[PDB]
Amino acid sequence: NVSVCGLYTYGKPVPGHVTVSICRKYSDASDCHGEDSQAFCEKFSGQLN
Amino acid sequence: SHGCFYQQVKTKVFQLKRKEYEMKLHTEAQIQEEGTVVELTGRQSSEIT
Amino acid sequence: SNATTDEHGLVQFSINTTNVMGTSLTVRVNYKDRSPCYGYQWVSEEHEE
Numbered sequence: 001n002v003s004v005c006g007l008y009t010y011g012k013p014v015p016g017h018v019t020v021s022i023c024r025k026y027s028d029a030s031d032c033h034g035e036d037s038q039a040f041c042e043k044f045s046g047q048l049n
Numbered sequence: 050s051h052g053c054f055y056q057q058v059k060t061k062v063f064q065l066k067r068k069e070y071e072m073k074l075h076t077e078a079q080i081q082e083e084g085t086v087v088e089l090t091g092r093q094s095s096e097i098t
Numbered sequence: 099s100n101a102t103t104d105e106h107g108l109v110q111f112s113i114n115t116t117n118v119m120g121t122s123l124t125v126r127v128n129y130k131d132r133s134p135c136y137g138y139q140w141v142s143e144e145h146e147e
């Protein structure tokens with residue numbers, strides 16, 4: 001479970017949409033190579049409650 | 050039966066990335082009212098460009 | 099003196115001539131980099147020249 005919520009005053013559950021994106025990017029990437037760093041990526045999305 | 054089955058798959062979910070590694074292809078061609086399903090590994094050896 | 103692709107990829111071109119016997123040529127859209135950070139470079143990428 002990964003709960004996410006953006007509330008303008010922390011007491012006001014707002015509507016909208018949100019996407020939690022998570023990606024095995026690297027252990028000790030240098031990024032002078034210029035290739036894309038993400039190893040894995042498992043994107044989940046959901047409209048706000 | 051019309052024309053043929055076709056398919057159109059996207060390379061994004063496959064993450065066509067540099068350290069996203071080679072692919073292999075193998076098709077489960079199931080047969081109706083016989084059940085003796087065939088599998089075939091054709092085109093499988095991907096092409097590391 | 100830059101140029102661009104014709105319909106068929108192709109290109110035709112004269113080049114001025116008052117020099118010594120040896121001449122060695124090349125053409126790019128990208129530019130030359132001999133810029134690896136570390137001799138392993140499992141990270142790697144290439145464009146044909």
Ligand SMILES: *[C@@H]1O[C@H](CO)[C@@H](O[C@@H]2O[C@H](CO)[C@@H](O[C@@H]3O[C@H](CO)[C@@H](O)[C@H](O)[C@@H]3O)[C@H](O)[C@H]2NC(C)=O)[C@H](O)[C@H]1NC(C)=O
Binds near residue numbers: 115
């Ligand atoms: C590089 O390309 C140029 C053309 O853009 C070549 O220039 C040509 O050179 C010859 C020999 O000099 C020229 O013939 C004569 O040049 C003299 C220069 O003072 C002129 O007084 C004469 O009336 C006569 O034109 C020729 O005119 C010239 N090209 C043109 C525009 O006609 C050059 O030869 C090429 N590189 C080399 C040296 O291979």
